[PDB]
């Protein structure tokens, strides 16, 4: 599906995204919109048979496998299609392993370019919270 700022807020929040590694909820919703407007089925093909899927665009050469890449590690140790179902529990689950190594959310090129430095915790406000 396609989400609604608010609708996705409380979902991330039930999945432990509020504050995790000192990133408040707010941060999360914002990387969402500038990665794929809050579109789950959304995939995007980069240059070297590389692909970023769903809600947060977790890219295949590093985190998941879509059977095809000369590199392909599956650090998140899952199947990229886990990433294209409206069941967000494979994206959030993986995000936290992403966030956990070095670069924090600065690893979501659109979070460091569009919400880093802004008033993030607004993204979350009005969504009944």
From Swiss-Prot:
Disulfide bonds join 6-127, 30-115, 64-80, 76-94. CDD domains: LYZ_C (cd16897). Its EC number is 3.2.1.17. It holds the Pfam family Lys. Transmembrane segments: none annotated. SMART domains: LYZ1. Coiled coil: none annotated. It is found in: Secreted. One of its GO terms (cellular component) is cytoplasm. Keywords: Allergen, Antimicrobial, Bacteriolytic enzyme, Disulfide bond, Glycosidase, Hydrolase, Secreted, Signal. Lysozyme C is capable of both hydrolysis and transglycosylation; it also shows a slight esterase activity. It acts rapidly on both peptide-substituted and unsubstituted peptidoglycan, and slowly on chitin oligosaccharides. Monomer. This is Lysozyme C. It comes from Gallus gallus. The lineage of its organism: Eukaryota, Metazoa, Chordata, Craniata, Vertebrata. The gene is LYZ.
